[PDB]
């Protein structure tokens, strides 16, 4: 209940909030039914259209009009956007040639270039090209501004998570908005689209741009707009705010459009009925740029044209039903659609077993159009686990399909488009264009993740970003002028460089190796290998930096080089270069069980084979593969206890294929590759490395910890006519984070040869170097000829393995 006996007289779209019970006059008031009685009358005029006609120029002012064509309207800052064109014989913004904007042309009293964020729902990346013929205003922005072919959203590819990630730079798991619909088990409440619960502040974490602005003395226009407020009014409101005196005037503005998402659901992504929605966006953009030209701001303001996600062909008939897999369907709640989330219907039931739910959903039909995971087993690049609002059980749904619980939920067909799938899917990609004095001229940039923009928008506004998941500096190549020069973090732990300190007989590991067969030329030469005489062949980008306090040793060998952790009893990283000319060999008969002690590292800081024998679930593998040894002699180095890592047999299949076939293959395709591999420990699935006392799993009867994942970073020359190990120019990279899992239930073809399923699993588990840095606490690419900004961009790249957009 609100007494709304006040008035909006003089308060149309006031910027600060007066609380209950006094009536409101802001673009939010409708959503509370707390607008003053006269709001519609005064603040939402609609009379006489949104365009000056030839027969309205120099007219007498009449306050009841929606906009004005009167001689004094320029001053009042409330002209129609085409006032100058029709009346003063000016040309539309779109119809002028674009001159480069080498410096801000801002009128007096403007201390900084404003920022307008023009956000559009469901604007699929491929609209920029496939609709270019009917979007001339936006094609001017794109071609004269700075654009990327596409921009990658976050999972899930839904509106709320993506809009709030754009405003926070945070992953959904961090900011809290993990779906359009949500249940919080601590709150005992649901977050929905229709309803008022979504308004409470307790859902929203992190610090969005407008709060970041306000707290640092930069005033902001409001971001939310009510559904009923038409777009034309929204633009005039932004143009009026810009007329406000210097000390009242916001520096950052936002506009939003429900289109083209709204129509895309009805007609699909490319239905013929989509041309019209696109025409209207362009028209709206036209009114803004025309209106800015009127205020002498068109070479002063920076404009961001950005979408939240794309759109895919989806229909009712393409629905999987859980009622055809489970018998016990009324014992679960599903959050359905382009992604599934399952939980117990009642927490009062003791016999609710997720192991058995996943069983019944795994590879149960050759058709199957979805795949269950436990959230911690999701690809780490999705960063979709670390929140109480995300249910333990998750369904990754195939592009073009839906998941529902029972058939009745789907009839008690209409739609032809939807969105929400995995964020590396082409149809889900969206747009970025930046145009203005601070952005670059006629410049294309590589695709980037939307988590990066918060940082840039803070830069555009001279703000200091709140802690976020962007990598600040990685988008400096978008900007004409930078206020952030990124600097490399300092190494926390310096290594030990141990020599030969131990005799064989001091080791009691229970490990045998047949290696007792017997020169000054080639015996002087392999000591040199252990001092690192070939370290600049196998360690091309300097040693990783350890960014935490720990104790580790650098170990040199002929073929490879490692940083060995005395705490975790295995390498943090292993580095080696495989040239194009290198040859694959096999593990000879006599060395199949061979595990040699390392005489640089004490018995007490080593693994032992006895644990592996006694633990019937856990086998072992090697980080540097014996298969790629340079010679029969060097192959012995690969069997050192200090190259050894614990591996479930099931996972040895995956790993073996990678080491035996794929590395050589990549070395052929890319003219050699540098490989760095190591373990990852993340039992708390927060995407960050775990300390010694968070380890949940050891090899039975030992202090040998068990990685939750294994990673590799594969670098080469981008100019592939140059060997990896002699690259003059920019680098090219691909990475992965394989889940270390006791089975291969994730791959429904696993009973076949490794050549059918392994490389497919690895593609799904593609990863950014930065993702690995978070999980390891290391820092790569410390010594290159390349600028640090470029290296940041390199570390944020993700190889998607998709086709061309
Ligand atoms: C992506 O980027 C983000 C952002 O950088 C990364 O996330 C950050 O990660 C940090 C490390 O995990 C984490 O630090 C915690 O913070 C704990 C308390 O923090 C509270 O305050 C936060 C700050 O808010 C303020 O923000 C601005 C400044 O930027 C200020 O101006 C304002 O005043 C703000 O208030 C606040 O964000 C945070 O809120 C979370 O919880 C709310 C609900 O309770 C949510 O609404 C909100 O969204 C946040 O939720 C996310 O984060 C929590 C983790 O806190 C997570 O569980 C949720 O799922 C969700 O994702 C807080 O209210 C602090 O207690 C922690 O310190 C403990 O650990 C240290 C370790 O050294 C100990 O030394 C210390 O003693 C302490 O231990 C205590 O706990 C032990 C057991 O738990 C116990 O035994 C012991 O005795 C102690 O009691 C630690 O510093 C940041 O909070 C987090 N920030 C954000 C925004 O999420 C993220 O890692 C990145 N991801 C990747 C993959 O890189
Ligand atoms: O005006 C806004 C916000 C504007 C905004 C602009 C810029 C932003 O960020 C930054 F500038 F920082 F980048 C952030 C927010 N609203 C109103 C409409 C509702 C209803 N609504 C829907 O109907 N979605 C359609 C849908 C439903 N299912 N899939 N799609 C989704 C919801 C969005 C929020
Ligand atoms: Ca962790
Ligand atoms: Zn959306
Ligand atoms: Zn939608």
Tell me which residue has its CA closest to atom 30 in ligand 2. 159
Task: State whether the beta carbon of 159 lies less than 6 angstroms from ligand 2.
Answer: yes
**Rounded to 5 degrees, what are φ and ψ at 479?**
-100, 150
Tell me which residue has its CA closest to atom 61 in ligand 1. 174
**Catalytic site positions:** 159
Sign of CA dihedral 201, 206, 212, 216: positive
- Give the atom of ligand 1 at the shortest distance from the alpha carbon of 467: 5
Nearest-angstrom CA–CA distance, 680 and 683 = 10
Query: How, if at all, do strands 252-260 and 115-121 pair?
Result: parallel
DSSP 79: B
Nearest Cα neighbor of 547 from 646, 689, 674 is 689
Nearest-angstrom CA–CA distance, 254 and 466 = 20
Reduced to 3 states (helix: H, G, I; strand: E, B; else coil), residue 802 is coil
Nearest Cα neighbor of 159 from 28, 262, 30 is 262
Q: Are 454 and 209 in contact (CB under 8 A)?
A: yes
Report residue 235 as tokens.
């633009």
Ligand closest to Cα of 457 equals: 2
Report residue 437 as tokens.
């004095």
Nearest Cα neighbor of 492 from 696, 686, 733, 689 is 689
Establish whether the linkage from the previous residue to 260 is cis, with ω within 30° of 0.
yes
Nearest Cα neighbor of 306 from 219, 374, 209 is 209
Report residue 766 as tokens.
């593609």
Nearest-angstrom CA–CA distance, 30 and 710 = 52
Binding residues: 121, 159, 180, 261, 265, 308-309, 419, 682, 684, 686, 688, 690
Sign of CA dihedral 792, 439, 429, 156: positive
Report residue 244 as tokens.
């406000």
- Ligand 1 binding site (Cβ under 6 Å of any ligand atom): 170-171, 173-174, 176, 205-207, 383, 386-387, 466-469, 687-688, 774
To which H or E segment does residue 418 belong?
strand 417-418
Q: Are 675 and 714 in contact (CB under 8 A)?
A: yes
Q: Is 606 left (phi over 0), alpha (psi -120 to 50) or beta?
A: beta
What count of other Cβ atoms lies within 10 Å of the Cβ of residue 152? Answer: 24
* Burial class of residue 337 in the structure, from the number of CB atoms within 10 Å of its CB (0-12 exposed, 13-18 middle, 19+ buried): buried
DSSP 259-307: EEHHHHHHH-SS-GGGHHHHHHHHHHHHHHHHHHHHTT-TTT-EEEEEE
Q: Measured in angstroms, how far is the CA atom of residue 122 from the centroid of ligand 5?
A: 6
Establish whether the linkage from the previous residue to 21 is cis, with ω within 30° of 0.
yes
What count of other Cβ atoms lies within 10 Å of the Cβ of residue 433? Answer: 23
Q: Are 115 and 253 in contact (CB under 8 A)?
A: yes
Which string of b and e fits 121-131 if b means at least 16 CB within 10 Å? bbbbbbbbeeb
Q: Which whole-number Å values give the CA distances from 41 to 19, 34, 67, in the listed order?
A: 22, 15, 14
Q: Measured in angstroms, how far is the CA atom of residue 161 from the centroid of ligand 4?
A: 9
Nearest Cα neighbor of 357 from 341, 369, 368, 346 is 341
* Burial class of residue 544 in the structure, from the number of CB atoms within 10 Å of its CB (0-12 exposed, 13-18 middle, 19+ buried): buried
Task: State whether the beta carbon of 29 lies less than 6 angstroms from ligand 2.
Answer: no
Task: State whether the beta carbon of 199 lies less than 6 angstroms from ligand 2.
Answer: no
DSSP 451: G
Reduced to 3 states (helix: H, G, I; strand: E, B; else coil), residue 493 is strand
Reduced to 3 states (helix: H, G, I; strand: E, B; else coil), residue 213 is helix
To which H or E segment does residue 237 belong?
helix 231-241
User: What is the dihedral angle through the alpha carbons of 681, 687, 692, 697, rounded to the nearest 10 degrees?
Assistant: -40
Q: Which residues contact 245 (CB under 8 A, 6 or more apart)?
A: none
Task: State whether the beta carbon of 117 lies less than 6 angstroms from ligand 2.
Answer: yes
Q: Which residues contact 247 (CB under 8 A, 6 or more apart)?
A: none
How was this model experimentally determined? X-ray
Q: Which residues contact 762 (CB under 8 A, 6 or more apart)?
A: 654, 658, 662, 736, 738
Q: Measured in angstroms, how far is the CA atom of residue 694 from the centroid of ligand 3?
A: 8
Q: Are 51 and 65 in contact (CB under 8 A)?
A: no
What count of other Cβ atoms lies within 10 Å of the Cβ of residue 211? Answer: 15
Reduced to 3 states (helix: H, G, I; strand: E, B; else coil), residue 256 is strand
């Amino acid at each position: 209940w609100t007494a709304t006996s006040g008035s909006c007289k003089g308060r149309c779209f006031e910027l600060q909030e007066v609380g209950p019970p006094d009536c409101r006059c802001d673009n939010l008031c409708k959503s509370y039914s707390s607008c003053c009685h006269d709001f519609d009358e005064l603040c939402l005029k609609t009379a006489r259209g949104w365009e000056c006609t030839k027969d309205r120029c120099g007219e007498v002012r009449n306050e009841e009009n929606a906009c004005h064509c009167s001689e004094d309207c320029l001053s009042r800052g409330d002209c129609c956007t085409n006032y100058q064109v029709v009346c003063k014989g000016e040309s539309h913004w779109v119809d002028d040639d674009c001159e480069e904007i080498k410096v801000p042309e801002c009128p007096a009293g403007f201390v900084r270039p404003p920022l307008i964020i023009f956000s559009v729902d469901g604007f699929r990346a491929s609209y920029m090209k496939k609709g270019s013929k009917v979007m001339p205003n936006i094609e001017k922005l794109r071609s004269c501004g700075t654009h990327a072919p596409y921009m990658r959203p976050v999972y899930p590819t839904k509106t709320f998570p993506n809009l709030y990630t754009l405003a926070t730079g945070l992953y959904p798991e961090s900011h809290g908005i993990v779906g359009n619909s949500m249940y919080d088990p601590v709150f005992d409440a649901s977050f929905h689209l229709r309803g008022r619960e979504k308004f409470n502040h307790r859902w929203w974490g992190g610090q969005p741009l407008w709060i970041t602005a306000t707290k640092q003395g930069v005033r902001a226009g409001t971001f939310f707009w009510s559904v009923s407020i038409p777009h034309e009014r929204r633009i005039l409101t932004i143009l009026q705010w810009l007329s406000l005196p210097d000390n009242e005037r916001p520096s950052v503005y936002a506009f939003y459009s429900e289109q083209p998402d709204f129509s895309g659901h009805k007609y699909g992504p490319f239905g013929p009925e989509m041309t019209n929605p696109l025409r209207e966006i362009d028209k709206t953009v036209g009114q803004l740029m025309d209106g800015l030209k009127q205020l002498r701001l068109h070479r002063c303001v920076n404009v961001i044209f950005v979408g939240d996600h794309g759109m895919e062909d989806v229909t009712c008939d393409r629905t999987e039903f859980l009622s055809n897999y489970l018998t016990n369907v009324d014992d679960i709640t599903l959050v359905p659609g382009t992604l599934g989330r399952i939980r117990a219907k009642s927490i009062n039931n003791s016999k609710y077993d997720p192991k058995t739910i996943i069983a019944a959903l795994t590879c149960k039909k050759p058709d199957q159009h979805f795949k269950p995971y436990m959230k911690q087993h999701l690809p780490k690049r999705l960063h979709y686990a670390n929140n109480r609002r995300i249910e333990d059980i998750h369904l990754l749904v195939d592009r073009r399909w839906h998941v529902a619980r029972k058939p009745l939920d789907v009839y008690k067909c209409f739609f032809q488009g939807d969105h929400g799938f995995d964020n590396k899917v082409n149809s889900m990609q969206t747009v970025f264009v930046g145009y203005g004095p601070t952005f670059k001229y006629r410049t294309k940039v590589p695709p980037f993740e939307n988590i990066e923009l918060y940082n840039v928008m803070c830069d555009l506004l001279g703000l200091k970003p709140a802690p976020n998941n962007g990598t600040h500096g990685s988008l400096n190549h978008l900007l004409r002028t930078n206020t952030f020069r990124p600097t490399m973090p300092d190494e926390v732990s310096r290594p030990n460089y141990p020599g030969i300190m131990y005799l064989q007989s001091e080791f009691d590991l229970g490990c045998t190796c047949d290696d007792k067969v017997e020169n000054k030329l080639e015996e002087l030469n392999k000591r040199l290998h252990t001092k690192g005489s070939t370290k600049e062949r196998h360690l091309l980008y300097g040693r990783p930096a350890v960014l935490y306090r720990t104790s580790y040793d650098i170990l040199y060998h002929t073929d490879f080089e490692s940083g060995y952790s005395e705490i975790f009893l295995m390498p943090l990283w292993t580095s080696y270069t495989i040239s194009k000319q290198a040859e694959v060999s096999s593990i000879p008969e006599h060395l199949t069980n061979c595990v040699r002690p390392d005489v640089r590292v004490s018995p007490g800081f080593s693994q032992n084979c006895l644990a592996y024998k006694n633990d019937k679930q856990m086998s072992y593998g090697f980080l540097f593969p014996p298969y790629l040894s340079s010679s029969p002699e060097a192959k012995y180095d690969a069997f050192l206890v200090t190259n050894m890592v614990p591996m479930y047999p099931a996972f040895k299949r995956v790993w073996a294929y990678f080491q035996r076939v794929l590395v050589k293959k990549y070395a052929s395709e890319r003219n050699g590759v540098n490989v760095i591999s190591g373990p990852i420990f993340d039992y708390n699935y927060d995407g960050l490395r775990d300390t010694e006392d968070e380890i949940k799993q050891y090899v039975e009867g030992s202090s040998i910890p068990v990685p939750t994942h294994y990673y590799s970073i594969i670098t080469s020359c981008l100019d592939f006519t140059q060997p990896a190990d002699k690259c003059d120019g920019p680098l090219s990279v691909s990475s992965f984070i394989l889940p270390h899992r006791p089975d291969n239930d994730e791959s429904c073809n696993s009973s076949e040869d490794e050549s059918k399923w392994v490389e497919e699993l690895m593609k799904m588990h593609t990863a950014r170097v930065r993702d690995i840095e978070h999980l390891t606490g290391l820092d790569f690419y410390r010594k290159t000829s390349r600028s640090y900004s470029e290296i940041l961009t390199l570390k944020t790249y993700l190889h998607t393995y998709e086709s061309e957009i």
